[PDB]
Amino acid sequence: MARWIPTKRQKYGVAIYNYNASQDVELSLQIGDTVHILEMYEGWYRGYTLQNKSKKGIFPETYIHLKEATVEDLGQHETVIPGELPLVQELTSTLREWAVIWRKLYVNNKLTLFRQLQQMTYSLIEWRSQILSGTLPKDELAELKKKVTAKIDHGNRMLGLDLVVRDDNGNILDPDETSTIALFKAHEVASKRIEEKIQEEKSILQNLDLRGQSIFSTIHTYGLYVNFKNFVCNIGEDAELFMALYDPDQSTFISENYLIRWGSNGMPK
Amino acid sequence: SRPILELKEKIQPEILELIKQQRLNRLVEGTCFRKLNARRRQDKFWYCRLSPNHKVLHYGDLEESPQGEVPHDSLQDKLPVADIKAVVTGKDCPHMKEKGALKQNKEVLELAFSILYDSNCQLNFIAPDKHEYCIWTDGLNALLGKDMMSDLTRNDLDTLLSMEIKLRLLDLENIQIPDAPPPIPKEPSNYDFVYDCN
Amino acid sequence: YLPSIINDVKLVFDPVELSVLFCKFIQSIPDNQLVRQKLNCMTKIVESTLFRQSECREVLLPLLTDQLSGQLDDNSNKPDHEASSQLLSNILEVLDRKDVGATAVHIQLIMERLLRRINRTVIGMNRQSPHIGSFVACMIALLQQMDDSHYSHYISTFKTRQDIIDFLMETFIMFKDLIGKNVYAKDWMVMNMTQNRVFLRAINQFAEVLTRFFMDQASFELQLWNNYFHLAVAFLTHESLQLETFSQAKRNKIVKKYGDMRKEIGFRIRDMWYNLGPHKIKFIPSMVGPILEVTLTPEVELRKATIPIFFDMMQCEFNFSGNGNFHMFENELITKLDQEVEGGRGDEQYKVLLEKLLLEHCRKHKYLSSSGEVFALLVSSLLENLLDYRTIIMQDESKENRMSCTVNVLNFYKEKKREDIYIRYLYKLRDLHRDCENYTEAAYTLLLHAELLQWSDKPCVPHLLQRDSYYVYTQQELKEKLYQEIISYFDKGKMWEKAIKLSKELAETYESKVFDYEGLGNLLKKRASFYENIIKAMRPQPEYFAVGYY
C-alpha cells in the first residue's frame, strides 16, 4: 500500500459482499456500503465510509464496482433520465430513515401504523425497482413521481417528519433558495396534501365510497365492461340477444344494443 | 443468493438482541396475568410487572383490573431472577396434573407456565392466549439468555432480517456477487503511504 | 375582464399609454366601491404586461402603493387583509424575476412606499389564526429581495432621530414576537430556515445602523441594547444540535445549505458587545444572564469565543470596581447559572473549558482577577455539584436518590450561603416529601426555612419572598403562615410534641405582637386537641436499621 491520489470520481464505492477484514481499517463491509473514498490506489481504495465518514478503509478495486459518478448525475450524464435520479437518492435516504423509525417502532405498540408502514414500504420499494429502469412512458414517470411523493410525505406526516417541496424534478429546485413566495405557496401546497390525506385516512382506510367520489370528480368518461359467460334459456331456435343499458326511470335505453347471437343448441351460434 | 444468504444470516445478532430487548420492554410493561381456578370470587386478573432494572417482578393477587397494570408495590414485588431454575410449560406443570379442585382443563394446556423457585415454590400462571403466552416465555428465556419460543419471534427474525438485507442490496443493483469471493490483489508490504493519512 | 385584454392590447398598442390610461381609470374609482374586485383587477393587471417594466412599473405602481397604504390603516382593513396580502405577494414575486428587467431602484421605491406600512401592519396584524403568515411571507420576501445599500439608503436616513428610534423599537419587538411564538407548523423547516436567514440579514443591517447612529456618537438615548440583545439571544435560542440531529443528514443538509447560523450570530454579538465600550458597565448587571445560555450552547467554537466575554464583563466591573468588586455581577451569574444548569443544559467539557479560559484570562490580570480565580474555583465546584445532581436525577429516578442529591446541593448552598437558591431547593425538597407524604420531614424542611425569618415586622429581604405569592408579607405574617402549615403537617404527621411546642411560640407571638385573640382561641383549641390525642391514642414505634454500604 502506497501511492494514494485524491479524487471525487469514486463517490460510489460499491462493495460486492461482506469484505474480508484484512485491513486494520476494513471489516465485513456491508452490501450497501457506498463509501466516500478519498484516496485511490490502482487495486485498492481508502477513504470515508458511509457508516463512518470520519474513518478510512483500504478496499480492493476488484471489490469496488467503480463508478465515476457523484451525487450529481448530469455533469457526467449518469442520469438514466434527467430529473429523476435526485429522486432515487433522496428516496434511498428516506428508506434509511424509514428503517430507523422502524427500529423505533417494534419496540412500541405502534404495530398498526407499523404494518401500514410495512405495506407503504413494499409499495415504495417496488416502485423504486420498477423505476430503476427508464422504460416507463413520461406519463408513467410523472405519475410515479407524484404518487411516491405523496406516499413519502405521508410517511413524513404521521411520523412528524419535516416537509419537502418542489413536487416535480427531484423535489430540490424549490429548496434551492430560488425565491421566497414560491417557497411559501409550495409549502401550503404541501400542507394541502397533508390535510387531504390525513382527512382521507378515515375516508379510505375505513370506507370505500368517498374515494370513488373523489376519483370520479377528476374524470368524465367511463366504460362498463361486461363479460358474457353462458346463455341459459329454453328457446330451441336462433336467438338474438340485445343487451344494452336502460333507464327504467326515463323509460329508455342508455347504451346501444349489443347484438349477441344464440344458437338453437343451447350454445351461442 | 448463496453469498446473499450467507452474508444475511451471518450478520445475525443485532436483530436477535433487538427482539429480546423488545421482549424485556413487554415484560416490564406486562399486563394483568391469569391465576388458577379463579372462580369463587378470586381475581383472575392481576398484574405482573418487571422492574425497569429487570431484576424484580411486581406481581401478586391483584384485582380484576381491565386497564391492566397499576404501578405500585404489588402483593410481591420480588421474583428472584438470579435463581429461577426454569418455567414449566404444558404437561410439565404440576398444577396441570392436579386431579382435585385445582384441575386445569385441557383448554389451558398452552396457558400453563409455572416459574420455578425455592426448589419447591411454583407460580402456576395462565396466559389469556397463545401469542402473549409465548411472549412471556420469550421474555423469561431472555432473562435466561437463551433461544426464544414464540412463533411470532421467528416471524420477526425472518421478516426484519429480510428487510435489512433488502435495504442493503441497493448498492449492488445491476451488479453480481461472485459466489467465490473476488481474489485479493497483493497488497504491497510497504506502508509508506506516498499520500498522507486521514 | 378589462385586465383580460391587456396582454394582446399591449401587443398592438403603446405600452405606457395603456399604463397611464389604466392608472387614470383606476384612480377614478370612488374610494368605497368594490375594493375586493379592484384589488383582483390590479392583481391580474400586475400579473401580465409587467414582464416588461421600464415603461410601466414606475408608473403603474404609485397608485398601487397609494391604495395599499390606504389599506395600511383606515380601520376598514378587515375584509382586505388577504386581498392586500395577495396583491403584495404577487407583485413582490414579479419583482423577484431577474430576466424581466432591472428594478433595484424600483425596489428602493417599494421599500420607501410600503416598508413602514407593512411593518405597521404586522405589528398590528397580530393574531396567529388568520393568514398573518401571508404577510410574514411578503415582508420576508421584501427583505430578501432587498439590498443592504438599499437598507441604509433611506431607512437609515429618515427624519428626526426620534422617529427612526421608535421605528427601530417597533421593528425589534416585532422581530422578537415573530421569532418567539413562530408562525409556522415547524414542519416547514426550509421556510423557517429561510426566515432565519432573512432575519439575520436584517438584524445585521440594524446592527450597523446602531453602530453608526446610536454608539457613543449618540451620547445618550442608548437604552435599546437591552431590547436588541434580547432579540438576538432569543433568535439564538432554537435550531440546535439535537434538532439538527434527527436525521444524520439533517446536520449535514442544513450545514451544506446554510451552515451554522449560531456561529455568525454569536460572533456578531461578541464583536458588537466589544464595541459597546464605555457603556458596558452601565449595561452589565441586567444583561449578564442573557449571555450564559448562549455560552451554554452545545457547540464548541462560539462557546470558545463567548466565555471570554464573562472575563470582559468582570474586567469592565474592575474598571468600575472603585466602589467594590464584581459581587453584583457574580451574584446574578451564579443565580442564572443555577437555573440553567438545573434546567439540563451544560456539559462537563463546558465546565472544564470555563475553568481553563477564565483562569488563563485572570492570570494575565491582577489581584481582582485572582479573587475572580478563586470565585471561578467556587463556580467549578458548583458546576460539578450540579452535574452530579442532574446525572443522578436522570439516572436512578428513585425519589430517595433525588432527596439525597437535593440535600447535597442544599448543604453546599448553606456552605456557600447563597440563601435564595437555598430556599428554592428547600421548597423542591418539600415538594418531594409531600409527594412521599413524609409530613414529618416536610415540616422539618419548612421549619428550616421559617427558621430564617424573624418575628420582626419589616420584611427585610424579598429573597424569602418566594414565588408562591409575592407582595408585602411582613416577616411576621409569612412566619405565621409557615407555622400554621407546619402545625397542620405535624398534626397529620401524627407527632404532636413539636406541634404543641410550636403552638406555644405562635400563641406567644399572637398575644404579644398581633393581639388577635381569635387566633389565640383557635390555636389553643388545636393545642387541647393535641394533648387529647397524645394521652388518648397510641402510636407505633418505628424500627431503625443500620445500613452498611461497602
Numbering used by the authors:
A (entry chain E): 1 to 269
B (entry chain D): 530 to 727
C (entry chain E): 819 to 1368
What is the paper's account of this structure, in its own sentences?
The dedicator of cytokinesis (DOCK)/engulfment and cell motility (ELMO) complex serves as a guanine nucleotide exchange factor (GEF) for the GTPase Rac. RhoG, another GTPase, activates the ELMO-DOCK-Rac pathway during engulfment and migration. The DOCK-A (DOCK1/2/5) and DOCK-B (DOCK3/4) subfamilies specifically activate Rac and have an Src homology domain at their N-terminus; the Src homology domain is involved in autoinhibition and binding to engulfment and cell motility (ELMO) scaffold proteins. ELMO is structurally divided into two domains: an N-terminal domain (NTD), consisting of the Ras-binding (RBD), ELMO inhibitory (EID), and ELMO domains, and a C-terminal domain (CTD), consisting of the Pleckstrin homology (PH) domain and proline-rich region.
We performed 3D variability analysis using the 3.8 Å-resolution consensus map of RhoG/DOCK5/ELMO1/Rac1. This analysis revealed several continuous movements within individual protomers of the DOCK5/ELMO1CTD/Rac1 core region. Next, to capture representative conformations of the DOCK5/ELMO1CTD/Rac1 core region, we divided the RhoG/DOCK5/ELMO1/Rac1 consensus map into 10 classes by 3D classification. Five classes of sufficient quality were obtained with resolutions ranging from 4.2 to 4.5 Å and subjected to atomic model building and refinement. The resulting structures of classes 1 to 5 differed from one another in dimeric molecular dimensions. Structural differences were due to the conformational changes between the armadillo repeat domain and DHR-2 in DOCK5, accompanied by a shift in the PH domain of ELMO1. Consistent with this theory, our cryo-EM single particle analysis reveals that the DOCK5/ELMO1CTD/Rac1 core region is highly flexible and can, therefore, readily transition to a flatter conformation.
